[PDB]
Amino acid sequence: QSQLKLLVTRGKEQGYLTYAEVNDHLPEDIVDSDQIEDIIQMINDMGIQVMEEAPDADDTDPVRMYMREMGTVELLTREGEIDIAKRIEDGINQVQCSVAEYPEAITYLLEQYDRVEAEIDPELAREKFAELRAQYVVTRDTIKAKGRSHATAQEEILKLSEVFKQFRLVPKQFDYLVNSMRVMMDRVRTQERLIMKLCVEQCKMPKKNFITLFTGNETSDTWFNAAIAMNKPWSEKLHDVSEEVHRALQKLQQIEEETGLTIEQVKDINRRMSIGEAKARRAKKEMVEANLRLVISIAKKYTNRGLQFLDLIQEGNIGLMKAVDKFEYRRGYKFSTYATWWIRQAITRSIADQARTIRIPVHMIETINKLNRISRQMLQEMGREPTPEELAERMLMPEDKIRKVLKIAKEPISMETPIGDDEDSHLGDFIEDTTLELPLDSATTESLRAATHDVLAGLTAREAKVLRMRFGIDMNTDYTLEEVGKQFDVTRERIRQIEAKALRKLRHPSRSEVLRS
Amino acid sequence: RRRKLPATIILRALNYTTEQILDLFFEKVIFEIRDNKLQMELVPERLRGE
Structure with missing residues (x-):
């Protein structure tokens, strides 16, 4: 209505294309460098019909749209923070316990320890690993002996789990173990999904019958030969896949021999591990989502130094993302400052390198800044300009090193810089080729x-x-x-x-x- | 030099009510309702070209 009628009626055709007119007759926030091109594209060129393509198409900013979703406060207090942190520790605990349930993780740690000793107190390592090995070899005997039908034997198993929970492993080790268990489970579900895909679809066996039958042993051929001897219409098709299912069962039994665990319970421990992972991950995400303000707040001081606002606050977000990982609620120190340091370090370890086109080491940047901070006084504490010799004298470095330092400063200049202001000059156009x-x-x-x-x-x-x-x-x-x-x-x-x-x-x-x- | 705005918004920005704004540009005309009728403060000079 308003925009359409005004634009059309006025522009007929404004003669000299009077731009500085209707641009003020438009709503919303003005002085943008976005809507400008949408008017100089319609007025001329494809005249008449273009003025009909304009309305039909008419029928914004990164940071402002970032503050938008950031608007969702969900701020926390000491009670809130401690709560979320508690859920994190709970999740991590359940995961580690789920790992403790996995015996192959213990025996692998044992094997890799023997690898370590075959080439942090060495005697202390020989101490704790001896405890683990001792509890392992005592629990292992209570398995096939079957004394105390997994009642008191289970006590020794869980005690072994506690002993394993006494070890403080490296992140790479835990990730390797967990990933290994998930790969093992991937093979398990691979064989299971294989049997299902072969029996249900290829043999025309209803999913109801497959869930009713296979869910039992899942390993022994007792369910398979009973499915064939059921004399059902979908039982006769099983003969064309007997070898396949057999291969899957034999491989799954192999997995039983690999893990040394009941196949009808590995899903349980792996499930609970996944539960712990999702919980901890979720909690940590809530943490980083909560302390989002701190990042932008402190990143404001580091602005304008060879890196835009978004990059700064982004390095601060990942810095905060790292701070949340290494923190516990059972600590007198709050999160507001501990995270702040990690954020400062994160952004300062980013502005140092990924700023100028040419490479530069941290010590170089520090020396450069120090030179500037020192130089800003010599011309103010005297009256004349700071001579390079005297300026170098007030430092540990000789003088020529400083000379070489200033040869690394600046971006530097770009070719697209105007010089003579002709029609039109360019610095990169005077650069001759010599190769x-x-x-x-x-x-x-x-x-x-x-x-x-x-x-x-x-x-x-x-x-x-x-x-x-x-x-x-x-x-x-x-x-x-x-x-x-x-x-x-x-x-x-x-x-x-x-x-x-x-x-x-x-x-x-x-x-x-x-x-x- | 930006987008146009009604020149009465700056007056309000200077703490001027609508009634005050009207009493800064135009000459007021007072009407009285007495004896069940309508009277008017007639000014002869204002009746030029009407």
């Missing part, structure tokens, strides 16, 4: 080849080849006196004699003489 050779020089080089190729003609074979091979021309790889002296019988001096005699021949011709210059 190319003059056509004159190239012509002289070609004429030089022909000249030399014509000079070696007035020589003898046992002299032309000599000079040619010695200095290496028209044959790439040049040889020495020995490699030519062997191919020409007489060695060294003799071949040098002729090599000198050839040089004697070239004391009259003027071609190479003038080619010298």
Whole structure:
């Protein structure tokens, strides 16, 4: 209505395309560098019909749209923070316990320890690992013995779990173990999904019957041969897949032998582990989502230093993302400051490198800043400009090092910089190419080849080849006196004699003489 | 030099009510309702070109 009627009625056709008119007759926030192109594209060019394509199409900012979703406060207090942190520790605990349930993780740690000792107190390592191995070998015997039908034996199992929970593993170790267990489970569900895909679809067996039958043993062929001998219409198709299912069952039983666990319970522990992971991850995400303010607040001071606002607050977000990981609620220290340090370090370890086009080490940046901070006083504590010699004297470094330091400063200048302000000048247009050779020089080089190729003609074979091979021309790889002296019988001096005699021949011709210059 | 706005918004920005704004540009005309009728403060000079 308003925009359409005003634009159309007024622009008929505004004669000189009076831009500075209707742009003020538009709502919303003005002075944008976005809506500008949407008006200079409609007025002319595709006249008439374009003025009908405009309305039909008419029928913004990163940071402002970031503060938008950031608007969702969900702020926390000491009670809130401690609560979330508690859920984190609970999740992590359940995961680690779920890992403790996995015996192959313990035996693998044992095996890798024996690898470590085969090449942090060494005796202390031999101490704790001995405790683990001791509790392991005592729990292992209570398995096949079956004494105390997994009642008191389970007590020794959980005690072994506690012993395993006494070890403080490295992040890489835990991740490797957990990933290994998930890969093991991937093979398990691979065989299970294989059996299901083969029996249900290929053999036309309803999913109801498969869940009713397979869910039992899942390993022994007792369910398979009972499914075939069921005399059902979908039982006769099982014969065409007997070997496949057998292979899957045998492999799954192999997994039972690998993990040494009941196949009807590995899903349980892996499930609970997944539960713990999701809980801890969720809690930590809530943490980082909560302390979002701190990042932008402190990143404001680091603004304008070879890196935009978004990059700064982003490095601060990942810095905060790292701070939340290493923190516990059972600590007198709050999160507001502990996270702040990690954020400052995160952004300051980003502005240092990924700022200028050319590389630079941290110590260089620190030395540069220090030089500036020192230099800002010498011209203010005296009255004249800070001389480079005296400025270097007030420092540990000599002077020439500072000279080399200033040769690394600045981006530096870009080619697209105006200079003479002609029509129109560009700094990159005055930069001459030097890697190319003059056509004159190239012509002289070609004429030089022909000249030399014509000079070696007035020589003898046992002299032309000599000079040619010695200095290496028209044959790439040049040889020495020995490699030519062997191919020409007489060695060294003799071949040098002729090599000198050839040089004697070239004391009259003027071609190479003038080619010298 | 930006987008246009009604020149009465700056007056309000200077703490001027609508009634005060009207009493800064235009001359007021008072009417009285007495004896069940309508009277008017007639000014002869204002009746030019009407």
